[PDB]
Design a protein around this ligand. Structure first.
Ligand code: 8VS
Ligand code: CLR
Ligand code: CLR
Ligand code: CAU
Length: 440
């Protein structure tokens, strides 16, 4: 009675997919900084969604509104071949991203790919080549067709294009195209989240709660600071901070250093804090009585307040040595250090209390980047898994699943093509990128 409301919602979906994915593709094409191995795979993923929104979803909406197929038999064997192609090439790309992110975090070059940009193009071509054989060869050679009468009536009729497949195809094609790359993706990327948390480091811990500024700034106390929380001087003079900066770097800096020399200062200060923990008589027994995680929290305090200041927590150092983490967490809260900087002290106290990195989960920028990739994979799973689960259940018990439920679940996977550009807005780098492109 009212197909307009359904038709308008469908028209807004096609527009959101074409606009959103062309926006992602152009950002990677125009900006030199975005040319990376991951964004190459993002382009392959965005191209799959673009062909989805151009050549698949519009004809799928016309098929629903007209209750028939008005584009002929040739286009539908193609429309179905393209539809299966974009879903296969999407899950395989995600599987390649999860595997590529695994080797990046297990390598010494943490968060950086072991592939060159030319190898990434070779993998993408192979992905579409293998996906092309999986999607086109069964459809064009008619390896999918069923044998019953209702299916043969739809094949011989040009105005009917319901996707009837035999049970062997619906079982095999779902497993080889979707389930196998999905299970590998979920398993491998589950390990990336484990390694990111397990390989969490005091150098990344201090980077999180003190940031990085390669130009001179003032900290919460007003003192001049540069790098990763490297105190230059407590004097209000700016030449004094600049003069002390030149002595540490060995160069007239004018208050500006690079990241290569900012980390060298950071590595010096961390070693200075550790060397001060071992020399101090009060901190030495506590440090030897701690695991690697709680050792990092103790160096975090010494990094911020100095060796003499951390030794002042007389009671807290008793119980951190006495393995009584919960009691030490309360005394650490009752301190000027908690009142001064509570968000940092909260993360340190939690580290002392739980002995884990729960307070620094997804705080590092690279770990934020890995979380968004997890949302792309998780949302893709939630949108297509009900459809593919119903595929298998329909094969076992044929009478159970109606086509109204089948089309509904298929379109939940259809709207997934527009979610990727929205999820990429979690990145400040794409956010700046599309602001430039949209001229905002
Ligand atoms: C070595 N070169 C880099 O690392 C450049 C450098 C850079 C920085 C700032 C502006 C520009 Br222009 C370029 N960063 C980039 O290439 C960023 C790095 C990044 C930063 C923060 C986050 C997060 N928190 O989710 C995520 C990634 N990549 C991205 O955003 C990409 C991306 C991939 C996966 C999830 C979300 C975003 C693309 C999203 C879609 C369009 C194109 C980007
Ligand atoms: C038969 C028709 C309908 C299917 C459409 C196939 C198209 C969209 C496929 C075929 C080859 C694919 C390309 C293969 C290699 C690359 C290199 C990479 O840096 C960006 C993506 C890009 C450029 C792919 C995008 C999608 C692609 C162009
Ligand atoms: C296949 C038919 C039916 C639909 C239209 C296909 C379009 C969307 C495909 C075919 C080839 C694709 C291109 C292949 C290669 C590149 C280079 C890359 O650096 C940016 C994306 C870009 C430029 C792709 C954009 C999308 C593209 C033009
Ligand atoms: C309107 C119909 C044609 N749409 C198809 C789905 O969007 C995507 O379907 C699949 C993608 C990848 C592998 C697949 N194996 C199948 C077996 C039966 C039905 C769909 C699929 C399928």
């Amino acid at each position: 009675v009212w197909v307009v409301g359904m038709g308008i919602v469908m028209s807004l979906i096609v527009l959101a997919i074409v606009f959103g994915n062309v926006l992602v593709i152009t950002a990677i094409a125009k900006f030199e900084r975005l040319q990376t191995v991951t964004n190459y795979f993002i382009t392959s993923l965005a191209c799959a969604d673009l062909v989805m929104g151009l050549a698949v979803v519009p004809f799928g909406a016309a098929h629903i509104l007209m209750k028939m197929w008005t584009f002929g038999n040739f286009w539908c064997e193609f429309w179905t071949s393209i539809d299966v192609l974009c879903v296969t090439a999407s899950i395989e790309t995600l599987c390649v991203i999860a595997v590529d992110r695994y080797f990046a975090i297990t390598s010494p070059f943490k968060y950086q790919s072991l592939l060159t940009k030319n190898k990434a193009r070779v993998i993408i071509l192979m992905v579409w080549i293998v996906s092309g054989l999986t999607s086109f060869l069964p459809i064009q050679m008619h390896w999918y067709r069923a044998t019953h009468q209702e299916a043969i009536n739809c094949y011989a009729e040009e105005t009917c294009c319901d996707f009837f497949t035999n049970q062997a195809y619906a079982i095999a094609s779902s497993i080889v195209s979707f389930y196998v790359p999905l299970v590998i993706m979920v398993f491998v990327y589950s390990r990336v989240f484990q390694e990111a948390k397990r390989q969490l480091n005091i150098f990344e811990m201090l980077r999180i709660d003190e940031g990085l500024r390669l130009k001179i700034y003032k900290d919460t106390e007003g003192y001049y600071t540069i790098g990763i929380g490297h105190l230059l001087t407590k004097s209000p003079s700016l030449n004094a901070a600049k003069s002390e900066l030149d002595k540490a770097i060995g160069r007239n800096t004018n208050g500006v250093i690079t990241k290569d020399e900012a980390e060298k200062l950071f590595n010096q200060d961390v070693d200075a804090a550790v060397r001060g923990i071992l020399r101090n008589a009060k901190l030495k027994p506590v440090y030897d009585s701690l695991d690697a995680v709680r050792r990092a929290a103790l160096i975090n305090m010494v990094f911020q307040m100095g060796e003499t200041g951390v030794a002042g927590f007389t009671n807290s150092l008793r119980m951190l040595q006495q393995k009584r983490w919960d009691e030490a967490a309360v005394n650490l809260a009752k301190s000027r250090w908690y009142n001064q900087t509570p968000n940092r002290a909260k993360r340190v106290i939690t580290t002392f209390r739980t002995g884990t990195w729960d307070a620094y989960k997804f705080c590092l920028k690279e770990h934020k980047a890995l979380k968004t990739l997890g949302i792309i994979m998780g949302t893709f799973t939630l949108c297509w898994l009900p459809f593919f689960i119903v595929n298998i259940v329909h094969v076992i018990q044929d009478n159970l699943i109606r086509k109204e439920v089948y089309i509904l679940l298929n379109w939940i996977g259809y709207v997934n093509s527009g979610f990727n550009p929205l999820i990429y807005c979690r990145s400040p780098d794409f956010r700046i990128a599309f602001q430039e492109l949209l001229c905002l």
